[PDB]
Amino acid sequence: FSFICNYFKLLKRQGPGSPEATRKAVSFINELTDDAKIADIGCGTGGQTLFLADYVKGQITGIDLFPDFIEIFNENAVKANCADRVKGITGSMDNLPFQNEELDLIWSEGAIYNIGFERGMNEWSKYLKKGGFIAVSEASWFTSERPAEIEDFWMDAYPEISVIPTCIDKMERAGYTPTAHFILPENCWTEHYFAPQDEVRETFMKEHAGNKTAMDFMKGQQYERSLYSKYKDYYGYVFYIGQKR
Ligand SMILES: Nc1ncnc2c1ncn2[C@@H]1O[C@H](CSCC[C@H](N)C(=O)O)[C@@H](O)[C@H]1O
Missing domain, CATH: 3.40.50.150 (Vaccinia Virus protein VP39)
Structure with a gap:
């Protein structure tokens, strides 16, 4: 980590x-x-x-x-x-x-x-x-x-x-x-957990855009939102x- x-x-x-x-x-x-x-x-x-x-x-x-x-x-x-x-x-x-x-x-x-x-x-x-x-x-x-x-x-x-x-x-x-x-x-996930991460997603994308390990971490974060926004039930x-x- x-x-x-x-x-x-x-x-x-x-x-x-x-x-x-x-x-x-x-x-x-x-x-x-x-x-x-x-x-x-x-x-x-x-x-x-x-x-x-x-x-x-x-x-x-x-x-x-x-x-x-x-x-x-x-x-x-x-x-x-x-x-x-x-x-x-x-x-x-x-x-x-x-x-x-x-x-x-x-x-x-x-x-x-x-x-x-x-x-x-x-x-x-x-x-x-x-x-x-x-x-x-x-x-x-x-x-x-x-x-x-x-x-x-x-x-x-x-x-x-x-x-x-x-x-x-x-x-x-x-x-x-x-x-x-x-x-x-659900708002505990979207509003208080996922939304806050999207805010800093652009500054993050600009700084680690050329770094594999970093970008992979991003795919992970995005995959979590996908799982939640599809299996929340x-x-x-x-x-x-x-x-x-
Ligand atoms: N062995 C350990 N002893 C104490 N804290 C640990 C630990 N292993 C992981 N942690 C902490 O467990 C936390 C899980 S993330 C949750 C953070 C906070 N409770 C919140 O709800 O926002 C992280 O801060 C991680 O650093």
Whole structure:
């Protein structure tokens, strides 16, 4: 991910979502206090972390593997006048810097796939307080059968993808009460994820026009939009909310 990550740090969001989606996910947890501790795993540049900060109270800690994203994250916190309660730090998903039952809420949008839905659910449970909440958005299937094309894509990119029922089953096994789930509206993909990339598509085309690897990356981005604008009825992002029992 050489220039791949330098490309995404130019976007407000590195994955599908929306202020409304983050807000809807919050409507399912309990109200927190300024002393509550929250963690946004795979926060990226923190686009959704700031939406979250607007809907909940407490000290938020953003964690991401790419340091360049954290730099932007902390820069945005300052600009947003909330760097005192919202801080970003580089870290790994399979080695979180928290103590047992330290957090009131675990947040993660389009990032848990990096360690697997099931694995994440179980391993992150340790860091959550009794009665605490977890909210993550994951790519899932909306039906039991779908076209081969979309399927081959996901079984290659993210083999752990599954139907909603299976995702909820794993939450229970992980010791979470399946509080709620909802499919993110399409605008979370087009308006907040794809559209933003088209804007910088021309400046990008002019700078990397003569570079194979770069241009290939472009075909990929375009192929994603095609898959979505043709299979949106068979898959998408889903928000899962659970409370640790
Ligand atoms: N092992 C790991 N530990 C922590 N973060 C990781 C990771 N592997 C990948 N990531 C981060 O997971 C994020 C997935 S993209 C989603 C970014 C942001 N949550 C958004 O919704 O806009 C990226 O920022 C990627 O850098």
